[PDB]
Specification:
homodimer, mainly alpha, 85% helix, binds cobalt (II) ion
């Protein structure tokens, strides 16, 4: 469970950034996205 | 505001990982922390 709990925060975050980038086009914002994507994979991985 | 909204998700996340690492000592988990820390700084920065 704890890990699934990280999973959902991570997915809720990648939504807020996703929306933010739907309007303002900042590179830094989008650099954060790819950090969470990398993240998200590592989560499911060890989730199994 | 939107940016402050990212700020709080990011800070709430670094709490869940912080706690998780308070019990299980996975390197990957801690690699995520430092991604969010890097993140957090970029947020406040552009927050001003
Ligand atoms: Co919308
Ligand atoms: Co993340
Ligand atoms: Co506690
Ligand atoms: Co982050």
């Amino acid at each position: 469970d704890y890990l699934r709990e990280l999973l959902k925060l991570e997915l809720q975050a990648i939504k807020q950034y996703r929306e933010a980038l739907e309007y303002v086009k900042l590179p830094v914002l989008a650099k954060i996205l790819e950090d969470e994507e990398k993240h998200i994979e590592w989560l499911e991985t060890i989730l199994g």
